[PDB]
């Protein structure tokens, strides 16, 4: 009844959900780590407080995992192709939104951290612009949950 | 007002009256070129030209009333151009 | 068609396709490359670019 | 459209069609199309079908 | 199913019919279409084309 | 003084803009004594104001071209009559079926005698403003018109050269320049202009099927290469005329 | 260029009418009368900017190009000193 | 009636403007300008009108109309 | 009956609405956060009022979420190709119009914030420019609502 | 009757009309925003006038939208392929011409506003040149209206 | 009767004629606009003369429009393949010759306007050059008209 | 009888002859016009001699027109592939030889003119060099004429 | 027996001989002509000798033309693929050998001509290396004559 | 008997043998001609000695010629694919080897020429290194003589 190739798309859902979110979180953490490292040279005190861009990149990595486990736990022999496309769309939707969020967390994390050294009042601004970067991962999740559980 | 606005109001008044009265003429003669401008419906072909002729009167009146608004704009502007 | 007959795709079709695809990719690259070269050509106004 | 040849055994099994069917003996060509498609009296003798083999057979006498 | 523009013994029409020996016969099936297992109704299924 | 207003009006021709331009140019002239006192720093206004008389004249020609083209914002003018055919002219017992088809679907007017009103005495007929095919009709005409106007002004231009070389007493320039130059131009242009006017008189709706294409005969004339085949010739002995002029 | 500009002007004018003026037409006298007034003022503004200013300046320069090159080159050398009299009109 | 009557009217009208117009111009510094304006106006107007009216002769195909316009051509005229 | 692959285009539509708008809102956030952070050293107070580019970048991702949800709820195994193609169109229309709006919000937001740091008058200008950016995401939404409901 | 895939071209038409016109409007808005912002330091007054190139970039997105809606209303399951190709052509013909217009408004807007701040006489020249940029979208719209209705 | 996948080539004709011509007129307008802007600072008086390259680029869009319109009106359901390819060849020939002329005008307009402000005698040399630039658009038109009526 | 679709290559021949020679002439004109314009500031008298590279570039577009028209006149629906290919090869032969000649004309025009303003003796040299750049277009034309008429 | 489409290879033969030989001779000429005009400002006496690289660039285009004519006059409708591929081989073999020789002539022309103005002795050296650059066009010819005559 | 295309691979064999060795020898000659130019200005007496890398690059293209002639003399319509692919092998094998050896001769030539000029003890060193570079062309020749005669 259901097609041979049907589960390949469901698999590409799970894999993409993880891989592109890992890419997003890796980029977010690579830029943010660069920023924190170079910032800390004249600001011991900020080393702990400044890790929030990294923590929010670590959340993008969990949005990838959540969808990737939710897809993975729903793959099977009988999958009717329609559910596999839903799963691919879910996996790309969280995954590439995680990639976009990770890009934004990276850039605002680097610039925001460097600026926070120069002016500690920036820190609340850095949190606000990061909520607006991190929420793209959440929209990526919301769509992916809806698709993968339609 | 200011003279800029009064001069714009003169130009708009002249143009508006010229075009809307000329449209009034073409609507009153039931000119075929104006068919796309008349706001009819697929039901208005029933029996003959009666509905489209009633709509030709309505759009002629629309243009006549709009030309009246441009005449009022004109009379205002011809005062304001001397007062500003 | 009531009998569900095939779309009558001709023989030589791999040849038509590999003519039109590669002639069009050659023409489209020749246009793109030339267009890129002229669009990014040096306009050479050194007498005023500094004043 | 000319009707396809339809070998029938309990149900339709073999469907066959062409825009033009022709043959030649010693390079003398003939058109078989009117002698074949839509011909209700067409001679299908020696035809056979199986789950894993099939033999369409078209006989012409003249 | 299967479809071809010219199942034929003539090279001008693709030479799909092959004789390893001399022959007194020639044949051409212009737009040949055939289907001979898992047929349903009198209607052909989607055809793989020979080109 | 005229040729620039004329070509500009051919490019710009619209009845409504012609009026508006005329009104503004007239205003600039009738208030000239007041307006001349105004600031020089508004170079845009100074340009159009110094242009006021030339702008009036081109505005008048722009009304003229707008009227011949019978267009104001894709609307007709009530000044001219009509040659287009009412439904009673389709229902002559010939093409009565086309009237019934016309109730079901779009149709093209046959342009046949007994249906068509016959030759039109003005510019573009009003019907062309509503017609879906109007651009194909008008584009053929405007193209052919443009070619003629340009040819005639270039023929004037070489004629102006003759006068100028005479007033400088240059026999070499008129003898070796003007004579072969006008012959070169006139032989190419004359064939083309003759064919354009000929087509507009030698053919009709009956002769429209398999009618010859003018540009192909023009290209073939310049190529010296009509292959005795394809398009039919337009008139008797035309091959000799092609050969001679090229 | 004659034809080309003439087509472009016509089509710009046709689109501006069809997009702007057509929306002003309505089935009741008062509503259509008020709508048309503002609709034609917006339309007139667009006709001035696009047709009168832009297509006007286009047609103007093209008609001059035809003169300067494609007519005058056969007969006019266009090389010489401009005469400039000394006058108090320069003050 | 014949198309020749319009042609003779237009040819006479512009011909007088382009000949009799010049023959009534006075003597003065503007004379050559006035003559040139009259002649060039007559030639351009005549040629332009003549081309348009000639192109309207013997149409090779008529106008094509939208469905609704064809229905209105039953009654409006 | 309708082809089994037909749901694919609708799902890629849903994914696309989220993904390309997340890319838009990410780029808009990344450039805006760079500009805000770089400003802060010279103008510590403006970092609050300068959030607005980021808020509009967030709004582009919300438009892509809306169409990604509306598409994702409008899916079934037997979906006609006609409807699935509408959903693909809707997805790309909001998605890439949101990406376009994101490129605008980013470049405008960065240059507008770093300009406003030097020029307190510019704020009133750049908000109008940011509105003429963000409305691209709204035009994309309008065409996507229009498409997905035919 | 039509093939199942028929509506695809017409939908890519509707989307392309919006998408590429939104890209033209984004590019024109981004370059114009950069110019306006960067120059306003010397010229606090010209921010209110220099908006016009942004408005014209916005107008290119409106031209996209108009065609995108006109196409999208002209869709149906039963659409003949001819009308479906005409709708793709219309969509590209406004969309990419809008992209060309937006490029021109971007470059003319940026250079024009910079020049105007160095020489206020340029403002008129900039407006004229921007109309010659903006009308490229309107020519794209003419062809889209002609294609989409025949 | 006639195969479909045949009205498409003629549509690509009309589209190309508008699109690549609008690209040509955009690059011609943009480069000239950058020239005119940068020029006006040194010579504010030359603006009204230096518009010529913009208008010479302007005619390329219009040549595109002429062919686009001519092709578009000549389309039909089940158009003969030969007539449809002719419309493709026309559409490219104007569109891409328009593009060639667009670059030619852009480069010589940008250089020519700059040169003219340093030396007014260049005004005649510039417009002489703009003949052999703008004539490329015209030659694209000539062949396109020949093909469109062959 | 013989293949339909045969027109495509013949049509592409007409387009290639025009488009590539228009690209050649645009490059030739453009590059030369930057030379003329930049030179004229130093030597306001050399303008009217210096046009010759622009004129020869224009002649390359004439060669492409000549072949394109000859091809287009020689098209027919029933065109045997022998004539259709001969038209494509003619099209590319002038189109791309004209492109090559246009490259050469653009480079030797600019270098010739900039050199000639520094030393008027180069003018004859620029003409002789330029004849060898332009004759490549004439060779391309010869092969195109021979092919398209074979 | 002979197939259809046979002409393509033979025709691309003729065209490739001309096109790539013209590209070769256009690069040879563009570099040499740059060299001559940049050089000759200091050395008017060298103009009428330093032309030789350009003359040798012309000869590469002649080898192209020879083979392109020899192919174009030996095509026939339904030519066998064997002669047709041989005509492609001849086509490429001169054409690209002319392109290669074109690069060499260009570089020895530019460097050898510019060097000569500071050192007259180089001119005879430049002639010899330029024969070694020219003769690759001749090896291309020899192979192309051979292939086209089997 | 044998397949229709069969002779084509031997044809491209003959072409590649000449074309690729032409490119190598062209580069060889161009680098060496540049090195000769930069060397001659200081050491004019040295040219007749510094010709070595040029004549060796000319020898590389003779190895291409020899194979392209041998392959071409070995072609026929009835050729078996074995002989045809052996000849394509001969073609690339001399071709790319000659190309590569030409690159080594060019780069070692340009250095060896500029080096000898400053240090006469290197003239023998350049000759030796170039002999290793030439032998790489000879290896391509050896296998191409084997394959073309197999």
UniProtKB/Swiss-Prot annotation, chains A, I, J, K, L, M, N:
The keyword Cell membrane is assigned to this record: no
Modifications made to the protein after synthesis: Ubiquitinated by RNF182, leading to its degradation via the ubiquitin-proteasome pathway.
Recorded GO MF terms: proton-transporting ATPase activity, rotational mechanism; ubiquitin protein ligase binding
Segments crossing the lipid bilayer: 6-28, 51-71, 88-109, 127-147
Record's keyword annotation contains ATP-binding: no
InterPro entries: ATPase_proteolipid_c-like_dom (IPR002379), ATPase_proteolipid_csu (IPR000245), ATPase_proteolipid_su_C_euk (IPR011555), F/V-ATP_Csub_sf (IPR035921)
Tissue: Expressed in brain (at protein level).
Chief location of this protein within or outside the cell: membrane
Pfam family, one: ATP-synt_C
Lumenal side: 72-87, 148-150
Cellular component GO terms, alphabetical: clathrin-coated vesicle membrane; membrane; proton-transporting V-type ATPase complex; synaptic vesicle; synaptic vesicle membrane; vacuolar proton-transporting V-type ATPase, V0 domain
Record's keyword terms, sorted: Cytoplasmic vesicle, Hydrogen ion transport, Ion transport, Membrane, Synapse, Transmembrane, Transmembrane helix, Transport, Ubl conjugation
Gene Ontology BP terms: negative regulation of autophagic cell death; positive regulation of ERK1 and ERK2 cascade; positive regulation of Wnt signaling pathway; synaptic vesicle lumen acidification
Membrane topology: Multi-pass membrane protein
Subcellular location: Cytoplasmic vesicle, Clathrin-coated vesicle membrane; Cytoplasmic vesicle, Secretory vesicle, Synaptic vesicle membrane
Superkingdom to which the source organism belongs: Eukaryota
PANTHER family, alphabetized: V-TYPE PROTON ATPASE PROTEOLIPID SUBUNIT
NCBIfam families to which the protein is assigned, alphabetical: V_ATP_synt_C
Entry's family note: Belongs to the V-ATPase proteolipid subunit family.
Name used for this protein in its record: V-type proton ATPase 16 kDa proteolipid subunit c
Curated annotation (Swiss-Prot), chain C:
All ranges on the Cytoplasmic side of the membrane: 34-51
Stretches that traverse the bilayer: 13-33
Protein name: Renin receptor cytoplasmic fragment
Organism: Rattus norvegicus (Rat)
Gene coding for it: Atp6ap2
Part of the whole protein covered: 291 to 341 of 350
UniProtKB/Swiss-Prot annotation, chain D:
Tissues of expression: Expressed in brain (at protein level).
Family membership: Belongs to the vacuolar ATPase subunit S1 family.
Post-translation changes: N-glycosylated.
Cited function: Accessory subunit of the proton-transporting vacuolar (V)-ATPase protein pump, which is required for luminal acidification of secretory vesicles. Guides the V-type ATPase into specialized subcellular compartments, such as neuroendocrine regulated secretory vesicles or the ruffled border of the osteoclast, thereby regulating its activity. Involved in membrane trafficking and Ca(2+)-dependent membrane fusion. May play a role in the assembly of the V-type ATPase complex.
Section covered of the full-length record: 248 to 309 of 463
Domain of life: Eukaryota
Record protein name field: V-type proton ATPase subunit S1
Glycosylation-annotated residues: 8, 20, 43, 50
Lineage: Eukaryota, Metazoa, Chordata, Craniata, Vertebrata
Gene: Atp6ap1
Record's subcellular location: Endoplasmic reticulum membrane; Endoplasmic reticulum-Golgi intermediate compartment membrane; Cytoplasmic vesicle, Secretory vesicle, Synaptic vesicle membrane; Cytoplasmic vesicle, Clathrin-coated vesicle membrane
Subunit structure: Accessory component of the multisubunit proton-transporting vacuolar (V)-ATPase protein pump. Interacts (via N-terminus) with ATP6AP2 (via N-terminus). Interacts with RNASEK. Interacts with TMEM106B (via C-terminus).
UniProtKB/Swiss-Prot annotation, chain H:
Coiled coil: none
Tissues expressing the protein: Expressed in brain (at protein level).
Keyword Ribonucleoprotein in record: no
Residues exposed to the Cytoplasmic side: 26-32
This protein's GO CC annotations: clathrin-coated vesicle membrane; synaptic vesicle membrane; vacuolar proton-transporting V-type ATPase, V0 domain
GO molecular function: proton-transporting ATPase activity, rotational mechanism
Cell compartment(s), UniProt: Membrane; Cytoplasmic vesicle, Clathrin-coated vesicle membrane; Cytoplasmic vesicle, Secretory vesicle, Synaptic vesicle membrane
Family designation: Belongs to the V-ATPase e1/e2 subunit family.
Function as written in the Swiss-Prot or TrEMBL entry: Subunit of the V0 complex of vacuolar(H+)-ATPase (V-ATPase), a multisubunit enzyme composed of a peripheral complex (V1) that hydrolyzes ATP and a membrane integral complex (V0) that translocates protons. V-ATPase is responsible for acidifying and maintaining the pH of intracellular compartments and in some cell types, is targeted to the plasma membrane, where it is responsible for acidifying the extracellular environment.
Entry protein name: V-type proton ATPase subunit e 2
